[PDB]
Design a protein around this ligand. Structure first.
Ligand SMILES: [Cl-]
Ligand SMILES: [Cl-]
Ligand SMILES: [Cl-]
Ligand SMILES: [Cl-]
Length: 288
């Protein structure tokens, strides 16, 4: 039934599916069929969905038509590949998350196909997304990406690059942890900067939580960090006032404690970084 096939799909109605069915004659060619599907349905994922409905609900009396519909669907899949099938696989997730975000489901499916169409590291995902979404919305988008990928791994098929998706899920999980980290900086950085300003300590006026968080992540990802290289990172960020430098170092030490256990290679590595930061705090006081 068209209503059943359209149930819970916010982008196609039962009426639209029945209309398409009724417009397709018994002797329609595959080309005729695709022309009508294209006219009535704009998005390739939804076209593919409509084609599944048409094939599946053509009765035996219309054997010729069923064959033509199967050919039409095969041609559509030949045309689009993963662009149709991958998007179709995540249709309902895209609708759920589009509702959350108040955006188009199709735009989310395009983003999903962009993310899943290449290797991306966490850094690359952050860079793509931060120009397109607020940090708050990035967290929601990350949940969408995770849900979509898990759905495709459940579905399998030639247009699902399962091993690639597994790696992207690891990197997305990493992104989620980075976003949580950024929330700590978003809370604390304005407080620190306002506190310094209230005591007449000048800090660069373009310094914000993102820049501070970027410096912290650079330190935890450095293959050869040292106490001196942490202190220098901080001085490059906020300048040379002893209280400014101390405040950022304490903030980094606190951030370390709370960072996920996926953004370090081991608990030993996290401890080593903490000891470096503590050594930098001591150095800053000695040299004051
Ligand atoms: Cl058209
Ligand atoms: Cl196929
Ligand atoms: Cl949109
Ligand atoms: Cl997290």
């Amino acid at each position: 039934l068209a209503d059943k096939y359209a149930s819970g799909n916010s982008e196609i109605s039962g009426q639209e599916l029945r209309g398409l069915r009724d417009a397709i004659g018994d002797d329609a060619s595959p080309e005729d069929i695709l022309a009508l599907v294209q006219e009535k349905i704009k998005d390739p994922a939804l076209q593919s969905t409509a084609l599944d409905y048409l094939v599946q609900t053509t009765p035996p009396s219309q054997g010729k038509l069923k064959e033509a519909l199967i050919q039409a669907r095969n041609t559509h899949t030949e045309q689009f590949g993963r662009t149709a099938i991958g998007a179709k696989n995540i249709l309902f997730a895209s609708q759920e998350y589009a509702d959350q975000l108040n955006v188009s489901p199709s735009g989310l499916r395009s983003l999903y196909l962009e993310v899943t169409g290449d290797t991306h590291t966490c850094d690359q995902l952050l860079s793509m997304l931060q120009d397109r979404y607020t940090y708050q919305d990035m967290a929601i988008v990350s949940s969408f990406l995770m849900k979509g990928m898990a759905t495709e791994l459940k579905r399998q098929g030639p247009y699902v690059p399962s091993a690639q998706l597994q790696v992207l899920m690891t990197e997305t999980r990493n992104l989620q942890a980075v976003l949580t980290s950024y929330d700590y900086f978003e809370s604390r950085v304005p407080i620190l900067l306002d506190s310094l300003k209230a005591e007449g300590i000048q800090t660069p006026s373009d310094l914000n939580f993102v820049k501070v968080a970027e410096s912290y992540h650079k330190i935890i990802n450095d293959k050869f960090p040292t106490a001196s290289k942490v202190e220098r990172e901080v001085r490059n960020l906020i300048g040379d006032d002893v209280d400014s430098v101390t405040g950022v170092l304490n903030l980094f030490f606190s951030a370390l404690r709370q960072t996920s256990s996926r953004l370090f290679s081991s608990a030993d590595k996290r401890q080593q970084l903490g000891a470096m930061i503590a050594n930098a705090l001591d150095a800053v006081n000695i040299n004051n």
